[PDB]
Amino acid sequence: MGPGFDFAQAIMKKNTVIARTEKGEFTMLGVYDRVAVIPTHASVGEIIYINDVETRVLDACALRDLTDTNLEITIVKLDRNQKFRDIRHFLPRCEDDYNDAVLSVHTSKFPNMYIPVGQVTNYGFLNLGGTPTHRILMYNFPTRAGQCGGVVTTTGKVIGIHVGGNGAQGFAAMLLHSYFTD
């Protein structure tokens, strides 16, 4: 409808796949080459389904900060025959707050879904499903089951992936440029 939705659409149409694990279907953001991200609660194993194709997982790393605290991001390298467009230049370098964000989801249950979530707070610490978690972004939208892995964007930046909610608020794990240096 506007330049926020334009940037979100541009990411969704080239840099997402539908990932299926034994824990469900997730929006999965491809970042560069065959490297993608997904919430750690997806419990990625040795095989994952990518757009309903059986795909070997070449590597999966559940990220933690240097306090050994959960960040809720798993970086996955896929044995796929095609690279993602490299979007690492759209990742923020530092922890920050944002105005006027969009949460975008694409699964069997929610195809082509875009939500204007408004102001995003650098919330920091969250007890997420009983697990102490750092680098959490918060937005005041009643997100629901099916949106985990959803991409959070502003105009010009890809800032996080949706990992949870409490019925009134939604929470995303930060994406930082430093997670994807090669």
Curated annotation (Swiss-Prot):
Reactions accelerated catalytically: Selective cleavage of Gln-|-Gly bond in the poliovirus polyprotein. In other picornavirus reactions Glu may be substituted for Gln, and Ser or Thr for Gly
Limits of the Peptidase C3 domain: 2-180
Active site feature: H41, E72, C148
Compartments in which it is found: Host cytoplasm
SUBUNIT field: Interacts with host IFIH1/MDA5; this interaction inhibits host IFIH1.
Function summary: Major viral protease that mediates proteolytic processing of the polyprotein. Cleaves host EIF5B, contributing to host translation shutoff. Also cleaves host PABPC1, contributing to host translation shutoff. Binds and inhibits host IFIH1/MDA5, thereby inhibiting the type-I IFN production and the establishment of the antiviral state. Cleaves host MAP3K7/TAK1, resulting in inhibition of TRAF6-triggered NF-kappa-B induction. Cleaves host TICAM1; this interaction allows the virus to disrupt host TLR3 signaling. Cleaves host IRF7, resulting in inhibition of type-I IFN production.
Protein name per Swiss-Prot or TrEMBL: Protease 3C
Organism: Human enterovirus D68
